[PDB]
Amino acid sequence: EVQLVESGGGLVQPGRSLKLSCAASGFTFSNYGMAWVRQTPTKGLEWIASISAGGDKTYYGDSVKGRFSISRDNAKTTHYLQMDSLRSEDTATYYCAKTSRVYFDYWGQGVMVTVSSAETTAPSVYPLAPGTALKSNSMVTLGCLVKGYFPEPVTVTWNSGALSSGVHTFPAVLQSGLYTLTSSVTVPSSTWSSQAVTCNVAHPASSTKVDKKIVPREC
């Protein structure tokens, strides 16, 4: 099974640098060329950089005006995109891709890069529990409110990822330069009343890692 795993993204001020890494496995790394392709809401998919299977030759897309440089380390099954002189128009999700002669056969999960002069704002995390009612159900929806952060993304897990069924992370709203989202989980009432249910919220850009246990509302 081919795997491509990007890292090295995040928030950067205009003019500075990032270095994205892509760690590959499940194929002979030295046998194929590698590449970076980015995506924005408005401009779509846009090829950024390619390196030949042996590392001999490098190619760069139009908008990367020799500001970036790609390289590889076959020993470490990893390739890198060094990105200098970033501007706000460089803000996008960056994917790594493996090539197969005439196409990109496999894509990574993508890593977000935000180029902005605005400073990171860490989110406030609040527990969401249903209001007390006379009638109760067999399934219950709990949530975590992740309020007023910048920039994207945040991730939310539940019980450190042990609770993965019935999890929904709703896409954020944006108001006055800050994002808000809710993550919800539907769990058996019997699970909630027999063990702790905790959301784990991470905001990399502000190095925020927060756990919030959801406890029932009382009278």
Binding site: L134, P216, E218, C219
Partner: protein
């Protein structure tokens, strides 16, 4: 149409710096006419205020009863308060709200309230001999007794009745409860 909007306009909350606050309307006041328009419900008040605003009326006359009238004096003329007509185009409001009233919406089975036969629809007038006008007041009075007996004066179908109950400890929360749910819909 939430049922609370179809009740008489008894003011429960006055927003600081509102038209209402600056003109001197107070919690407890009962608004009965504006310009127009007879006001019998919260819906009437809202409709009248929207109509006056959209009609280009900028000030109007507001009639309210404040407090309990002396026997025989209940029908005495009440003079105008002059209010600015809130600009509905800008989403401006008068600045008053009912708050939830102490009307029982539901009773938990097996609760102290259930055991003593309190019923949905009951209005709680007094808690341990103190008058209350809001659900919030009910909550704070009940919470004050912290395990002690609670005497409730209730209105049911025009008839005042007496109830006494001992709050129950919920071991889950370590706090007392009597088992009353509000009417909010």
């Amino acid at each position: 149409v939430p049922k609370y909007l179809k009740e008489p306009v008894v003011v429960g909350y006055v927003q600081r710096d509102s038209i209402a606050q600056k003109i001197g309307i107070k919690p407890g006041d009962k608004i009965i006419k504006i310009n127009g328009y007879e006001v019998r419900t919260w819906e009437d008040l809202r409709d009248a205020l929207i109509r006056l605003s959209l009609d280009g009326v900028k000030e109007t006359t507001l009639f309210l009863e404040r407090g309990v009238a002396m026997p025989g004096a209940e029908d005495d003329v009440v003079l105008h308060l002059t209010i600015k007509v809130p600009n509905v185009q800008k989403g401006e409001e008068l600045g008053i709200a009912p708050l939830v009233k102490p009307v029982v919406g539901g009773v938990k089975k097996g609760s102290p309230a259930d055991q003593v036969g309190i019923k949905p629809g009951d209005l709680i007038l007094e808690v341990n001999g103190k008058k209350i006008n809001t659900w919030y007041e009910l909550v704070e009075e009940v919470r004050k007794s912290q395990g002690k007996a609670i005497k409730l004066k209730i209105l049911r179908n025009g008839k005042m009745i007496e109830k006494e109950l001992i709050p129950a400890k919920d071991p889950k929360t370590g706090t007392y409860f009597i088992g009353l749910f509000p009417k909010t819909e």
